[PDB]
Structure 1
Amino acid sequence: SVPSQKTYQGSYGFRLGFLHSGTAKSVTCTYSPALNKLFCQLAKTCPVQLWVDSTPPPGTRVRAMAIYKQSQHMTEVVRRCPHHERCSDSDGLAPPQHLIRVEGNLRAEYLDDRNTFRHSVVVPCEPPEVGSDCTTIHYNYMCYSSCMGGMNRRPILTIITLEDSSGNLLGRDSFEVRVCACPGRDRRTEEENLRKK
Structure 2
Amino acid sequence: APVIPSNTDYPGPHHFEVTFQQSSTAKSATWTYSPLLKKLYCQIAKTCPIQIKVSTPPPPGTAIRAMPVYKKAEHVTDVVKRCPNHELGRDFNEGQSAPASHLIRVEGNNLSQYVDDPVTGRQSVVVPYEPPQVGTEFTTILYNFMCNSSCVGRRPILIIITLEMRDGQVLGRRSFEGRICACPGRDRKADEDHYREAENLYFQ
SS at 1:143's partner residue? coil
TM-score by length of 1: 0.94
Match of 2:201 in 1: none
Residue 100, structure 1, aligned to residue 100, structure 2: no
Match of 1:70 in 2: 72
SS at 1:72's partner residue? coil
Match of 1:127 in 2: 131
| Code of the aligned partner of 2:87 | E
User: 2:186, 2:68 → 1: CA distance?
Assistant: 23
Match of 1:7 in 2: 9
User: 2:125, 2:89 → 1: CA distance?
Assistant: 19
Match of 1:188 in 2: 189
User: 1:37, 1:127 → 2: CA distance?
Assistant: 26
TM-score by length of 2: 0.91
Match of 2:84 in 1: 82
User: 2:55, 2:197 → 1: CA distance?
Assistant: 37
Two-structure CA RMSD over aligned residues (Å): 1.2
CA contact (8 A) 1:23 1:187 kept: no
The structure whose Rg is larger is 2
Residue 110, structure 1, aligned to residue 111, structure 2: no
* Residues paired across the two proteins, number: 194
User: Offset of 1:5 from its aligned partner?
Assistant: 1.4
User: Offset of 1:193 from its aligned partner?
Assistant: 2.0
Percent of pairs with identical residues = 57
User: 1:61, 1:115 → 2: CA distance?
Assistant: 21
**1:50-104 CA deviation, whole Å, 9 max, x = no partner?**
1111100110100001010111110111111111112332364421100000111
Match of 2:174 in 1: 173
User: Offset of 1:131 from its aligned partner?
Assistant: 4.6
- Gaps spanning 5+ residues in structure 2: where? 199-204
| Code of the aligned partner of 2:107 | E
| Code of the aligned partner of 1:168 | Q
CA contact (8 A) 1:23 1:183 kept: no
Residue 144, structure 1, aligned to residue 148, structure 2: yes
